[PDB]
Design a protein around this ligand. Structure first.
Ligand code: MG
Ligand code: MG
Ligand code: MG
Ligand code: MG
Ligand code: MG
Ligand code: MG
Ligand code: MG
Ligand code: MG
Ligand code: MG
Ligand code: MG
Ligand code: MG
Ligand code: MG
Ligand code: MG
Ligand code: MG
Ligand code: MG
Ligand code: MG
Ligand code: MG
Ligand code: MG
Ligand code: MG
Ligand code: MG
Ligand code: MG
Ligand code: MG
Ligand code: MG
Ligand code: MG
Ligand code: MG
Ligand code: MG
Ligand code: MG
Ligand code: MG
Ligand code: MG
Ligand code: MG
Ligand code: MG
Ligand code: MG
Ligand code: MG
Ligand code: MG
Ligand code: MG
Ligand code: MG
Ligand code: MG
Ligand code: MG
Ligand code: MG
Ligand code: MG
Ligand code: MG
Ligand code: MG
Ligand code: MG
Ligand code: MG
Ligand code: MG
Ligand code: MG
Ligand code: MG
Ligand code: MG
Ligand code: MG
Ligand code: MG
Ligand code: MG
Ligand code: MG
Ligand code: MG
Ligand code: MG
Ligand code: MG
Ligand code: MG
Ligand code: ZN
Lengths: 59, 122, 127, 50, 84, 103
RNA sequence: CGACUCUUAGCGGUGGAUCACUCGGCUCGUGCGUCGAUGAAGAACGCAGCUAGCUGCGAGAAUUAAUGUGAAUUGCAGGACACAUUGAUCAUCGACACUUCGAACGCACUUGCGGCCCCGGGUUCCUCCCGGGGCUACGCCUGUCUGAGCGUCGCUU
RNA sequence: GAGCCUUGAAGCCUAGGGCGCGGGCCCGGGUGGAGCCGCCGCAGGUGCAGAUCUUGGUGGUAGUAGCAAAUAUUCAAACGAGAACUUUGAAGGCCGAAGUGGAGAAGGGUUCCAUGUGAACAGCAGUUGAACAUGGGUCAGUCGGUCCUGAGAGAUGGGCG
RNA sequence: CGGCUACCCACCCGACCCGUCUUGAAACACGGACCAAGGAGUCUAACACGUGCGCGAGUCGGGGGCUCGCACGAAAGCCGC
RNA sequence: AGGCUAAAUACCGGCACGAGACCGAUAGUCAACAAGUACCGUAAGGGAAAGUUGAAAAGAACUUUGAAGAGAGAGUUCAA
RNA sequence: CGCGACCUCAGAUCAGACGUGGCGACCCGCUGAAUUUAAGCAUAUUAGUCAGCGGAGGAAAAGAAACUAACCAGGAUUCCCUCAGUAACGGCGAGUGAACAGGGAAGAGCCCAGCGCCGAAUCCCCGCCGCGCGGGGCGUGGGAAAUGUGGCGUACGGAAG
């Protein structure tokens, strides 16, 4: 997820839980060389990323 | 005729948040679809949905400020954002009452010797 | 002769204010005269151009008595387009030719609620 | 440097954004007189100076 | 060896981006700015150079607040609401 | 520097004078402003005459001009007392009073 | 006879002079007199469907609301086309909103470290636990509260 | 000057005709495409051959000097219109561990990677590149900053101004 | 047939490369490779002389004021105790 | 040895306006154009060059040579 | 020993309010040279200017004589023409240099401390009550300031009783 630079891991986790109703294991954020923030959010083992991607745009 | 600000002023603030939530959800869906190379016809609705979100937020803030001003009307020590915002110069100036207020000596002088209308020719 | 000390006669200033005029002034600048039988009917001399009204070219290369209709009013270029006043490209495709609205005379107007108001206002001001 | 601070990286981000060619859809714009970008900075020729 | 061989030793830096002006006049060692003097509450302007004020005075920027005061002064700083 | 024959000159242009030179290019505009101000004041005070306050008879002090007579600022308190009108009412009547002048 | 060189004319090339044009300057005059602690000037970052700069804007970000005008913007598809609903653009702009630094104000600024009160989720509670909101700089004016004086005084142990 | 002009103004060129001693000017012809000039007075930022004059452009030199610091290249094939400089294989060599190796700090800021073209850049060339265009790439409780003081800088109390 | 010339060529004679410092320059004295554009005695105050004009033992309204608001009028006209 | 007060006065900055016996792209403000921009120096600071197609792009379809740059025909415009 | 009052004082994230900085063409306060001239240079001139610092307003400063004159006296202040390149200053050299008249533009004058009288008749704050559009002032009651001195009445042109 490309998120705002002002958001931290807790805010990213809360936003994901509130928007997609899925559990979060951890979040790894990094500032891209262009100025944006990219976050790898790992889902809980009970959830599958394929169905979340099919539900929200990306396939 | 998608979203007009004149009809939103009649609805209560409880419906405005509900009408803004799904609007933000649609904006997010459009943003996710924009990343995909397809659906070029939907790439133009981002502007109008953003403008409608701005309109809803504007009506919400207008109603909030109107309610706050109606509450603080006629009360001493109103909030600073509710106080006038003309400029820093006129805020420190004397009020009209203090400007029109004159001392008793000058009042008595003007009452005793007023400015008489006159003319000089015969 | 000019007498108001608040309006200028400077050529450069007039050209600047004409070339950088807002869109609501460009519609007043792009005005076209009306036909003779319609001028006596509406008691008005000129009228701005819109998209729906018909018009007839009086001067230029594509001039004649063939009645035409406007399809685009290009305010940015102070020009209008007619569906029959066109030209062929190198490959043979058609493209509209631009003619200034001052060089064209109107024969038909779209009877709109605002157009009738403008017409009656101009008539009452001409008195 | 291999490691920098957020302010310097944010300053470099705008230079990266600006170092872009001219789009080809403005050449046909009415009244356009721009033919090429005169602000293209090369990483080797012109140093931006921190 | 005072020229080309000595120029290769330039590795450090004595000036970074300022905090108030954003220019590269801020000194790291003296902790002051070379264009405005950031620790000083007053901005250092000088009449000796006429071109310094030309790049720093008002009107040479955005004027996010000064743009609207000249527009609202023409109406006498109104506070009411347009009719209807 | 001097020539065959000529009047010795001492021009006072040794100072930096070019940075302070008052050109009277606004003289017609100033006269127009003064005329408009006079007309506006007279129109606002129309029942009263221009230069309303009456001025007394004043002789010139110096021996060079003491043969002629001129106008002045105001009438003296002694003159007001001989006239019989109060001091403070003369101002609103239209009589300029000069308390500093003696008789 | 040829080649080379030199002098003229025609054509061609480099070259961008003269001429003509000018949304630009310079000068003169007139009208007004307006910044900020209710956050000034200036700076940083970001914002457009496709967008690098200027311009215009502030997470409501190439503009919001209202008024006037009345059928568009335009480089290209789309899009509200609807106007006997609310109606595009443009201008005006009095109503909302206005990120960070910056007199810059919680300390310093390496975006760190805090301290109080309140509201939602965590062992349903403090105890150096997440999110959000408000306050937390200097000097000084009037008044209130707190309290120090072998400075002066009265009654008392 | 009831002046000349889109039936062609200014400007430019000309082995053409001609005037004035001269500064200069008139006409013809060829380009050119929108203004210009005579007479009477007025006011100039008014006449260039130079100033190691300022700016811009162009010649002889001259297709000349120069593409020579550090031992060295060769054969076959493929992709390609184009091969000595690219790629693969083989042979012959250098750096030989204080390297022509593998990693870092300062500094650079996208130069890293993939794809694609080959006018510009690479001092010859190029199918190649750190060039160009597009798209990606940097994931930390236990790597470092953040904590602590060192030489040192610094506000308040106070002093000076 | 006639034609000077801003076309070319040849012979006869004369013919040193321009500018300024200098008694002396073509100098083995200095500047100039060439071409196009820009480039240098201006303006203000004061003084002296001469000339033109108007008035004349007088002369001068440049300083202000007056008429009507004026593109030409930041002009021009007038003050008369 | 205490104090207040408009007037005629000044204004190269600011917000608007009008005018010119001024300049006409090596001139005029450094800047008529993405100009205090590119660029230079660590910094104070220094600081440019650069206008003109055509009335309307109507910006040369198509055939051929060349891998392309480019060119030969053809085509629009009164005029390439 | 304690209590209370006064008086010099300290603290608060106490309630309310104010200043910081920027522009700076014009204006006000301070100190502030040298290049130049003097055909040299010290006094002088440049100049009580440039640079430097501190402040405000559309204007600021000035402004109601501890004034000018020495006769038939005038009468705030500001600006213009004259006075005047004059009186005067100066290695009396270079140079510097006003003021009073007078005529014009405009012309607005006053207050207070003190001396005395008025039972402090004065002022700020708090809260309920009666009022008007966009919100602040009039009448009521207590908490402070103030007798080491509120306010009317008074201002050298006299005033008070
Ligand atoms: Mg002009
Ligand atoms: Mg065009
Ligand atoms: Mg640099
Ligand atoms: Mg001589
Ligand atoms: Mg030629
Ligand atoms: Mg709107
Ligand atoms: Mg600080
Ligand atoms: Mg918070
Ligand atoms: Mg022709
Ligand atoms: Mg033309
Ligand atoms: Mg000249
Ligand atoms: Mg020359
Ligand atoms: Mg030379
Ligand atoms: Mg050039
Ligand atoms: Mg050469
Ligand atoms: Mg050779
Ligand atoms: Mg070598
Ligand atoms: Mg092959
Ligand atoms: Mg090989
Ligand atoms: Mg070997
Ligand atoms: Mg070793
Ligand atoms: Mg090594
Ligand atoms: Mg390639
Ligand atoms: Mg090469
Ligand atoms: Mg690479
Ligand atoms: Mg690149
Ligand atoms: Mg782990
Ligand atoms: Mg650590
Ligand atoms: Mg210190
Ligand atoms: Mg102190
Ligand atoms: Mg010469
Ligand atoms: Mg000599
Ligand atoms: Mg000699
Ligand atoms: Mg010679
Ligand atoms: Mg010589
Ligand atoms: Mg020699
Ligand atoms: Mg030479
Ligand atoms: Mg010349
Ligand atoms: Mg006094
Ligand atoms: Mg005084
Ligand atoms: Mg005044
Ligand atoms: Mg001229
Ligand atoms: Mg230039
Ligand atoms: Mg082909
Ligand atoms: Mg000398
Ligand atoms: Mg000397
Ligand atoms: Mg001097
Ligand atoms: Mg002195
Ligand atoms: Mg100064
Ligand atoms: Mg200040
Ligand atoms: Mg102000
Ligand atoms: Mg007095
Ligand atoms: Mg004299
Ligand atoms: Mg002395
Ligand atoms: Mg002298
Ligand atoms: Mg002096
Ligand atoms: Zn700075």
């Amino acid at each position: 997820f490309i998120v705002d630079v002002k958001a931290n891991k807790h805010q990213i986790k809360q936003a994901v839980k509130k928007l997609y109703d899925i559990d979060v294991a951890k979040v790894n954020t990094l500032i891209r060389p262009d100025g944006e923030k990219k976050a790898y959010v790992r889902l809980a083992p009970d959830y599958d990323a394929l169905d979340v991607a099919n539900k929200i745009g990306i396939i | 005729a998608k979203i007009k600000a004149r009809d939103l002023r009649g609805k209560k603030k409880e419906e405005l948040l509900k009408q803004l939530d799904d609007l933000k959800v649609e904006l997010s869906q459009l943003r996710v679809a924009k990343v995909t190379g397809g659906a070029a016809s939907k790439l133009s609705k981002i502007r109008v949905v953003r403008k409608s979100i701005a309109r809803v937020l504007t009506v919400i803030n207008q109603t909030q400020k109107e309610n706050l001003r109606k509450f603080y009307k006629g009360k001493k020590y109103k909030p600073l954002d509710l106080r006038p915002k003309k400029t820093r110069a006129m805020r420190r100036r004397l009020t009209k009452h203090e400007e029109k207020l004159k001392t008793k000596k000058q009042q008595r002088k003007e009452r005793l010797y007023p400015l008489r209308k006159y003319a000089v020719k015969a | 002769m000019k007498f108001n000390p608040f309006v200028t006669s400077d050529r450069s200033k007039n050209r600047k204010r004409h070339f950088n005029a807002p869109s609501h002034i460009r519609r007043k600048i792009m005005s076209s005269p009306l036909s003779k039988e319609l001028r006596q009917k509406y008691n008005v001399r000129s009228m701005p151009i819109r998209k729906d009204d018909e018009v007839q070219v009086v001067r230029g290369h594509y001039k004649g008595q063939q009645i035409g209709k406007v399809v685009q009013v290009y305010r940015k270029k102070y020009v209008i387009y007619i569906e029959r006043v066109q030209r062929e490209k190198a490959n043979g495709t058609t493209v509209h030719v631009g003619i200034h609205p001052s060089k064209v005379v109107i024969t038909r107007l779209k009877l709109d609620k605002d157009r009738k108001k403008i017409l009656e206002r101009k008539a009452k001001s001409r008195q | 440097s291999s490691h920098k601070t957020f302010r310097i990286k944010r300053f470099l981000a705008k230079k990266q954004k600006q170092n872009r060619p001219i789009p080809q859809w403005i050449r046909m714009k009415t009244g356009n007189k721009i033919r090429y970008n005169s602000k293209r900075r090369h990483w080797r020729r012109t140093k931006l100076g921190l | 060896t005072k020229g080309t061989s000595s120029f290769g030793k330039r590795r450090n830096k004595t000036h970074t981006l300022c905090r108030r002006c954003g220019s590269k006049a801020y000194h790291l060692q003296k902790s002051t700015c070379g264009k405005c003097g950031y620790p000083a509450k007053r901005k250092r302007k000088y009449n000796w150079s006429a071109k310094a004020k030309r790049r720093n005075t008002t009107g040479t920027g955005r004027m996010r607040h000064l743009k609207i005061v000249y527009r609202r002064f023409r109406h006498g700083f109104r506070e009411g609401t347009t009719p209807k | 520097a001097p020539s065959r024959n000529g009047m010795i000159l001492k021009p006072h242009f040794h100072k930096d004078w070019q940075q302070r030179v008052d050109t009277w290019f606004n003289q017609p505009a100033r006269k127009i402003r003064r005329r408009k101000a006079r007309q506006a004041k007279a129109r606002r005070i129309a029942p009263r005459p221009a230069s309303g306050p009456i001025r007394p008879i004043v002789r010139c002090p110096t021996v060079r001009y003491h043969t002629k007579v001129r106008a002045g600022r105001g009438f003296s308190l002694e003159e007001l007392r001989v006239a019989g009108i109060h001091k403070k009412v003369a101002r609103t009547i239209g009589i300029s009073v000069d308390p500093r002048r003696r008789n």
